[PDB]
Design a protein around this ligand. Sequence first.
Ligand SMILES: OC[C@H]1O[C@H](O[C@H]2[C@H](O)[C@@H](O)[C@@H](O[C@H]3[C@H](O)[C@@H](O)[C@@H](O[C@H]4[C@H](O)[C@@H](O)[C@H](O)O[C@@H]4CO)O[C@@H]3CO)O[C@@H]2CO)[C@H](O)[C@@H](O)[C@@H]1O
Ligand SMILES: OC[C@H]1O[C@H](O[C@H]2[C@H](O)[C@@H](O)[C@@H](O[C@H]3[C@H](O)[C@@H](O)[C@@H](O[C@H]4[C@H](O)[C@@H](O)[C@H](O)O[C@@H]4CO)O[C@@H]3CO)O[C@@H]2CO)[C@H](O)[C@@H](O)[C@@H]1O
Ligand SMILES: OC[C@H]1O[C@H](O[C@H]2[C@H](O)[C@@H](O)[C@@H](O)O[C@@H]2CO)[C@H](O)[C@@H](O)[C@@H]1O
Ligand SMILES: OC[C@H]1O[C@H](O[C@H]2[C@H](O)[C@@H](O)[C@@H](O)O[C@@H]2CO)[C@H](O)[C@@H](O)[C@@H]1O
Ligand SMILES: *Cc1c(COP(=O)(O)O)cnc(C)c1O
Ligand SMILES: *Cc1c(COP(=O)(O)O)cnc(C)c1O
Lengths: 843, 843
Amino acid sequence: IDSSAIASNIQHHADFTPLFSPEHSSPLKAYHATAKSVFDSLIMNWNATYDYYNKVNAKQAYYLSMEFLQGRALTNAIGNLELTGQYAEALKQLGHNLEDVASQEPDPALGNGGLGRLASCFLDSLATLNYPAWGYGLRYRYGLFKQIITKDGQEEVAENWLEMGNPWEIVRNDVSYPVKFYGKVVEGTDGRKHWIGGENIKAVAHDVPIPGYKTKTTNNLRLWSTTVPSQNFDLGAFNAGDHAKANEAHLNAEKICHVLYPGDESSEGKILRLKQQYTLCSASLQDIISRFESRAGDSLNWEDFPSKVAVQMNDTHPTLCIPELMRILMDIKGLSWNEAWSITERTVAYTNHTVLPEALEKWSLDIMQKLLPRHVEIIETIDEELMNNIVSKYGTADISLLKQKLKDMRILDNVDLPASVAKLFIKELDPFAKYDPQFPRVVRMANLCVVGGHSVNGVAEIHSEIVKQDVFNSFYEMWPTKFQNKTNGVTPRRWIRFCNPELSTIISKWIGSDDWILNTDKLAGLKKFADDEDLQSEWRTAKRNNKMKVVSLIRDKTGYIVSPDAMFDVQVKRIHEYKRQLLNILGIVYRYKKMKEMSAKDRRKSFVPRVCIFGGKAFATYVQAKRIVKFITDVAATVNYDPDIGDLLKVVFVPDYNVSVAETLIPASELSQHISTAGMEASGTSNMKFAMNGCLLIGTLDGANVEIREEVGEENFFLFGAHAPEIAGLRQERAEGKFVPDLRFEEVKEYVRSGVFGTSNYDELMGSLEGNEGYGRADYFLVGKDFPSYIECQEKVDEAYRDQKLWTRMSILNTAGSPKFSSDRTIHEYAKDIWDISPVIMP
Amino acid sequence: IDSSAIASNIQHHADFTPLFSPEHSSPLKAYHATAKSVFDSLIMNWNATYDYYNKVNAKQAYYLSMEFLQGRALTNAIGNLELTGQYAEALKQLGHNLEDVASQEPDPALGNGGLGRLASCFLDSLATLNYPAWGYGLRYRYGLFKQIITKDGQEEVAENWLEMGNPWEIVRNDVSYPVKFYGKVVEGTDGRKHWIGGENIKAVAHDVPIPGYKTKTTNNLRLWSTTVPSQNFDLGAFNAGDHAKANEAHLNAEKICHVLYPGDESSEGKILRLKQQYTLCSASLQDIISRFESRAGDSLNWEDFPSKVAVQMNDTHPTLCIPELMRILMDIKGLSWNEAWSITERTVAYTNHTVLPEALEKWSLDIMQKLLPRHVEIIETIDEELMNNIVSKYGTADISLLKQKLKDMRILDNVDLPASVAKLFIKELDPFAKYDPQFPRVVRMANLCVVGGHSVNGVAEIHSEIVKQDVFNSFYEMWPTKFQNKTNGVTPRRWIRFCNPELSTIISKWIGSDDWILNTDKLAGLKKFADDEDLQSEWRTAKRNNKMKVVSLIRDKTGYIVSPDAMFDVQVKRIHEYKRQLLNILGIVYRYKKMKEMSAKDRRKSFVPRVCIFGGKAFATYVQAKRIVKFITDVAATVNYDPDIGDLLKVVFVPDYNVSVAETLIPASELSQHISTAGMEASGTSNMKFAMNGCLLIGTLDGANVEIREEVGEENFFLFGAHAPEIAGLRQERAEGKFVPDLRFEEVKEYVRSGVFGTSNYDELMGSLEGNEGYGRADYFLVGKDFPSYIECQEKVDEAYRDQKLWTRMSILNTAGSPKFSSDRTIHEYAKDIWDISPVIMP
Ligand SMILES: OC[C@H]1O[C@H](O[C@H]2[C@H](O)[C@@H](O)[C@@H](O[C@H]3[C@H](O)[C@@H](O)[C@@H](O[C@H]4[C@H](O)[C@@H](O)[C@H](O)O[C@@H]4CO)O[C@@H]3CO)O[C@@H]2CO)[C@H](O)[C@@H](O)[C@@H]1O
Ligand SMILES: OC[C@H]1O[C@H](O[C@H]2[C@H](O)[C@@H](O)[C@@H](O[C@H]3[C@H](O)[C@@H](O)[C@@H](O[C@H]4[C@H](O)[C@@H](O)[C@H](O)O[C@@H]4CO)O[C@@H]3CO)O[C@@H]2CO)[C@H](O)[C@@H](O)[C@@H]1O
Ligand SMILES: OC[C@H]1O[C@H](O[C@H]2[C@H](O)[C@@H](O)[C@@H](O)O[C@@H]2CO)[C@H](O)[C@@H](O)[C@@H]1O
Ligand SMILES: OC[C@H]1O[C@H](O[C@H]2[C@H](O)[C@@H](O)[C@@H](O)O[C@@H]2CO)[C@H](O)[C@@H](O)[C@@H]1O
Ligand SMILES: *Cc1c(COP(=O)(O)O)cnc(C)c1O
Ligand SMILES: *Cc1c(COP(=O)(O)O)cnc(C)c1O
């Protein structure tokens, strides 16, 4: 299977599955063709893998998520098939360049943060390790948004990734499932419940093959596109002139897949958010059920269901899986409550990803009751049961104790207790056991997930402890055997081998083979070579070579001109008060001010030259975050064009940070920042990407840094800031006026109010770092607190960078320390300890 | 290139361009694959033809139309490539059946009536005869509508043909043209006009190859799909919860291509109707201009434009081509008025298709002025010129005469005359030369088309005379050399060879070859064999064999059970008061009543057994037409289940009449009806299809029947009814109470009011056949008048069918008489006498 045949297959797809005029010649045209030529290998293998799983009828694992940051598939598919050399040559013959062709691929608009990229890494590992597993998600048309950076700060534009269609997917027209909204429940002849009426849509499957590395195993991300049958278009409306009304039905079905995490401060935004989730659950489960039945055939027994199916709820979005499975098993197959509940408990598992409350979903019962009346019936029964198990395991005797246990674990909050439990609170009836109209009736999804899943895990050792101690305590006490940990990871094929081929050469040379790509434990053999100077020379050169690609990026995307002989200092992540991009920039602002009040001789002596690179998207509606990116941009303009500074300091905000950007940025990075308020980050995965590439980490004792420190060693990691235990203390200290800030921190704040950074003075932004009390103020994320610790920590980073022997020694020990953070071992752990699945290898 | 390789190509497309799960097995899946396997041959040849035309830079002809009834492509593509035998065998190997696979193809929803099917026939002839010509149109998503027949009559459902995508098209992503609505005009530095602002959309090309018969020549139907760039989607709107507002821009662009001939009783429906047309013109012309320029290259001279381009305006919908070409030539290329006008005059030509006023488009100036302000400026200048040419060619002297000439030919009606011409009417100023607010300001498009095109033709000899005498008289007088005739035709490959293979065997046998398919004149050699009994036997059997396919159709689509040993009497056409389906059914109702008042012995003696088959769609908003289909259905129920009748008479209304239905119906037909009120049908093409298949015609001296009678001979055609000259006379006779109807016609009307045809008595419908005066009444289409002539004519049809030697002799002479009605010679005529194009044969 040689390069000359491949160049013919490329030509073929350009001409015989064409998207452009024949005489037209574009890199973009070359991409759609090359994509399709590669894809042929994936279809062959996809079908082989599909057919073999059906034969073997092995337990299949199903990963549900609202997010998938797939990123560009081309170079990773080609790389995994090991046709990387030959596709490169093929494109030379045709007057093209692979790097240039690959760069025309649009990033799928299917995700946002770690949650999505984690899921994606997971799928690559799962395929690579021959595990039978699919991903289920929604096919978002416009995604979250494409970030543009103007003079007003961030602006959001809808993404265009599907405008010419996605070559990396396959429409499965025979795979359509009906999904239902609103309606009402009634009891049929056969005493069985029947959910009728309401609005009805159909979800259609779009498959995205996941090619394994050096394996024929090709798994699948099945993506739901919602629509309605053309007949639901209203010609009466259209011919009468009312063209929007004519189109109402199509809009409502289709908007479900328009935007990721749509704004929900409106009742209409909530209903959509909820329709998004139900669709994911309903369509996905129906399909899972379907596959179980065709494989079972004549020998069909539902008790076999949890031994053939594992469903993984990634955060609380897919919670509805639980009652949805109960609906199908009872209303459609005629299983009894306990029979269905037993099966459900053992099929579902839950991973929590953040102690942040935007993930601890609460829903209005009234909305849910209206949209999904049958599911509320089911939850009502589940919550009645849950309370009877609590009654058993505790009280009747101690009522005030029992009262507390019931608040904590209740799924439906502020509802009239079931008759059974209300009994215990007569005096008559206690107000606690009664719905209070002064407050909302709420459905607490996280509790329902804890009840419904046989396993509950977090994503880092510190975090899964927080989960057991702070978040779900009464539940841990009841079912200690539910609670686990599965520390996150990242695929080393996309995040070393294919994003950083230059380093990858150096790695396989000194370890003696390239097997580490798969058996990443074998990177540890670099520890001993850490002080060899010849290794160090190749290692430093590689970093420098990758830095020149970023100089191109910054030049092109922002217009700024930046030298690669400086320290590349990066912070790229979702723009949130808690991740504290604000802390970082203010630290830069302090050094900027010091440089400006200092002689040009001393400037060289005092500070190492840096290029401080920010990136990430600010949730559009999040007002304060958006002001933070605006602010960063303003500082950039002021610093980069100052002749007193020059190449001693540059500050750059790279627009539209996504998988593609990270793939260039990360390998070129020498210092990355992960400086979240301690105990707020659950894990974080860029941490792990950076370390794999020999990037050093400056950060807090928070999430995955903790374990990353353990692996690479305290001496090869820049630690600063208050620790997790001390947080709420330092806050309440602030509340009673007891915190007095560093003199240097007051200096910076006022130097910002000086107005040297444009016509804006930002008294409003600095205002969130002041006062003792009140929402949006009181420096809740401890920026002013950790400030002095931090800027002092940055002095030690300077001094280390001065000894490039040391810096490179440490650089190397981070790569040597990374193997724990391979998504491969994250998968093994999941596979053994939760899913209980076995690999399946085709002959 | 053998059948065994083709079956592999089919398998390949099923697996390597898949639309369904791999284990799924459907006739439908087999179609999409087979379609794609055939398509590969078309792409090869499409590109060969494309490239060769560019080389030769031969004058290209461009057919613009709002309609294209393409019909199913599969068997016609396969047939034209002459791979018909081998594709049939290929499908047997794969466990499938071509007829069964072909029947899964959805009819494109791209047309409605003759206008569309004519255009389509034309494209097949043009490719077949090696003429360089494209068709330009819009890609309608939901089409006009899918007709369903319920107990309430007709109901309209939006068509679903694109739900899985069209295998027979190619998206040309590099071909996008901006189209602009509203806005305003301003004068730039360079004294040149500039149209700025307003709403902006983009039209994208979708190509549909037109394979020629036994030729490599593969021409093109370029179809415009309107949209906007994803960035015009409003995230602010979406995140705020206002999901319709977020989507407003996309809806407005996209709705342009949603429905064919959208209802326009609303100002909003008119603006759309107009946006549809402008888009067709604007996008198409820009593309034409573009191709001219790339072929011209360095040697570019605009005086060469009409020697390289011919644009054909099919009816008044593409009228805007005229001022649109003027816009581009002046505002974009900088040609002067006379330079651009000279070129425009010689590029554009106009075909009028009906003296019916829904085609003689009048537009409100105020709407047009708002939507297309620059185009009105241009029309204003054209109308000023037109009036100066009339001033020259007539008056100043005779003013009342000149007044009359100006009313008739004026493009803008009820507008203030230009200063120049207003001069001639001072007394002061004559009210005639002044805008009267008591009436609308109107733009008369047909006049503009006459002014703008170097040729004006009709579509049958009688009609093109009507056009010169009645419709455009003053214009004919001014420019007699503009006015022509091009009698319509139909492609004999789709309408004999491939719809009727059984007959096609018989044809090539007795003529000695199959060259007639191409050189259809050679059917004339059948005249002499008309009385050979062995020919007659094969001929009768074929008809009977094709009738058994219709028994299946009627059984399946309506549920009625009908014997093929009866006369198959068909009327299938758009349901219009003027085509007079009402006349036909009432004639049936008369025979029904006669049979019911008669002994069962006499019933056999008096009437030949018939199956009377109606079909066609009633424009949804057209209230009276819809009542006519309702009525027909009610009669069907009453007649078909009457034991006194049995198989002596059946009446059937076939739902959703389209190309596909006609392909089964026509070859099986023995009598077809074309009974329009004389002088109202321009041509008609089903006439010609029926005759080609040996179907006899009963009809009026109207449109193409006239010439069809001339060809097959008066003795082989059933003529009835008042003639064209006598019409308006018979009407005004009615107006002054002088018409007294036949006693048998009053009998039928009252027998309908009897209520024997269901709970409806239809006094409202019969009401349109009564009175002397008033809109919707007064029997304007002369149903009661022609009635006695007609039912008596049907007695002669009975008596002829009794002598099957005679009937079959006549059947044969109709096929022998058809060659004139081949779209091939219609094309030759157009090509020589209007377009002035030459064929181009590749080596
Ligand atoms: O992949 C990364 C994470 O993804 C998921 O988190 C998403 C949330 O579930 C989703 O709701 C959304 O959350 C945004 C809020 O909707 C939005 O209001 C805002 O929150 C602000 C609020 O606007 C403001 O009034 C207040 O002062 O501050 C709030 C934050 O403290 O922003 C939210 C996100 O930035 O977006 C999330 C992804 O961006 C998973 O749930 C999570 O576990 C993953 O880590
Ligand atoms: O392909 C066949 C023909 O196509 C084109 O004709 C189309 C018309 O241009 C288009 O406007 C439309 O016309 C329909 C009217 O819009 C609709 O109102 C109705 O007209 C009725 C009216 O509703 C009613 O009030 C009155 O009593 O009677 C009117 C008719 O006399 O129906 C019209 C069509 O049935 O549809 C046409 C195609 O269906 C070409 O223009 C034409 O030349 C072709 O022959
Ligand atoms: O982004 C989340 C939000 O959390 C904090 O809200 C505090 C607030 O200070 C209190 O008044 C009360 O409302 O407790 C909340 C935490 O439980 C921050 O105040 C705010 O800055 C931050 O944006
Ligand atoms: O479908 C068209 C429509 O045409 C006729 O309208 C007549 C009408 O009778 C007159 O009162 C005046 O309005 O002249 C028109 C023709 O110029 C028919 O009357 C009507 O039945 C028919 O539907
Ligand atoms: C790895 C990755 C993330 C997650 O980063 P955190 O460190 O968890 O904030 C987000 N976005 C993209 C594009 C990534 O590649
Ligand atoms: C030929 C044809 C027509 C045109 O028929 P007329 O006799 O002009 O009314 C309309 N529709 C279809 C599907 C056809 O095949």
